[model samples]
Target: ADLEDNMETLNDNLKVIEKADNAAQVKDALKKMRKAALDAKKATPPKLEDKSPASPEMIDFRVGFDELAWEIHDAAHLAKEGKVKEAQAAAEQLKTTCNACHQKYR
Candidate 1:
């Protein structure tokens, strides 16, 4: 229950992060997300350590989501720096990856 609460809070933090107007706000949100991830990891151990019924597909999906997230962060940074062209490229990459992952997983 505590972990679930933390996750919910983390989701809220992410919402704030997405709506953040500045780089500092994004950084703070990332920190909160990282904290949530670490807390969740500590609170819950893997149900299957060596065996995963959906390992391959799930792993790929996780990676895809992670890649998209980082790309979006890079795009945000570029945008903050006023590098519109670079930001656009990164944003495009993020969008493609995000779409691919969502379409496949969700």
Candidate 2:
């Protein structure tokens, strides 16, 4: 219903993408991941629970999720091209994005 749920959805789909054997699987998971990412953009993070919507931190947080959304979107296109390996590599970008953001704000 909120950011955590969206984050969980993103994680679940990421795992599915990681374990997927083909572009078809990757494309499915990628779309779900992008949805979660986009949804998360509208929610406040735990660290910023008390922050106003107009706060700088909130803006920054949203931008991060925006990047996440695009990352998943880009992966989908690669998967659609039947480039499973390249699509998976694009997913690797998500790991880097997640870890760096989590380290900063988690």
Candidate 3:
């Protein structure tokens, strides 16, 4: 519904990945993260909520979320295969994406 809501989902599930003991749990958490990323991709960024949809600011906002969503998708695939270390590695990459976007907009 809102960016703040999706942000919480992303943050909570990110925590889940770090603490989960099994592949299934990591997989489940990443799935929720993927959903949140995609949802945020469609939501208007709070920073650019006043901008037109086609404006560069809006476009960049969605693309930032797009990057995060795709990273989650990659992580999810690795987690689904029970590649725990590899999955965690990919999840780590997502934080880079998060930092980059949040640095600009948050």
Candidate 4:
């Protein structure tokens, strides 16, 4: 119950978080969200919940996170070169991956 509540709050906060234009704002929000996610992970009871189903779910999320980071890295380079279209395209790709995982796992 507590975990669910925390997750709901975190999810809601994520919408505003994405709109954070500055690194400081994003870092602070991500710090809080990361802690909430980690706390949820620690609260899980082993041997009570089925772990097998989580395997594929974890794989999907892990790959999605990895790809998202890679996209951001590329976007950063593109933006540095003043390629706004390329940077926006990379951001769109990241958003797509994020939506896919949220719909599938959340």
Q: Clash number for every model? A: 0, 0, 0, 0
Instruction: Give the per-residue Cα lDDT of candidate 3 at 31.
Output: 88
The order by descending TM-score is 2, 3, 4, 1
**Model 4, residue 79: displacement in angstroms?**
0.6
Residue 14 in model 3: shift from native, Å? 0.6
Candidate 3 lDDT over residue span 2-105, tens digit each: 78899999999888888778889889999888888888877876677788888998788888878888889899899888898888878877888999888888
lDDT string, candidate 1, 57-87, tens digits = 5466445545645555666677567665555
What TM value does model 4 have? 0.48
Model 4: per-residue Cα lDDT at residue 13: 42
Q: Which stretches of candidate 3 lie over 4 Å from their true place?
A: none
Better of 1 and 4 by TM-score: 4
Candidate whose TM-score is highest:
2
TM per candidate comes to: 0.44, 0.92, 0.91, 0.48
Candidate 4, 39-61: lDDT as tens digits: 55533333334555457655555
Better of 1 and 2 by TM-score: 2
lDDT of each: 0.54, 0.86, 0.85, 0.53
**lDDT preference between candidates 1 and 2, better one:** 2
**Superposition error at 44 for model 1 (Å):** 14
What value does the lDDT take at residue 98 in candidate 3? 93
